[PDB]
Amino acid sequence: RPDFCLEPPYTGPCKARIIRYFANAKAGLCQTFVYGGCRAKRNNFKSAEDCMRTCG
Domains of the chain in sequence order: 1-56 (4.10.410.10)
Contact in structure between 43 and 4 (CB atoms under 8 Å): yes
What are 19's strand-pairing partners?
A: 34
Say which experimental method was used: X-ray
Phi and psi based region of residue 48 (left: phi greater than 0; alpha: psi -120 to 50; beta: remaining): alpha
Resolution value in angstroms: 2.0
Contact in structure between 15 and 2 (CB atoms under 8 Å): no
Q: How far apart are the first and last CA of the chain?
A: 7
Rounded distance between C-alpha atoms, residue 3 and residue 13, angstroms: 23
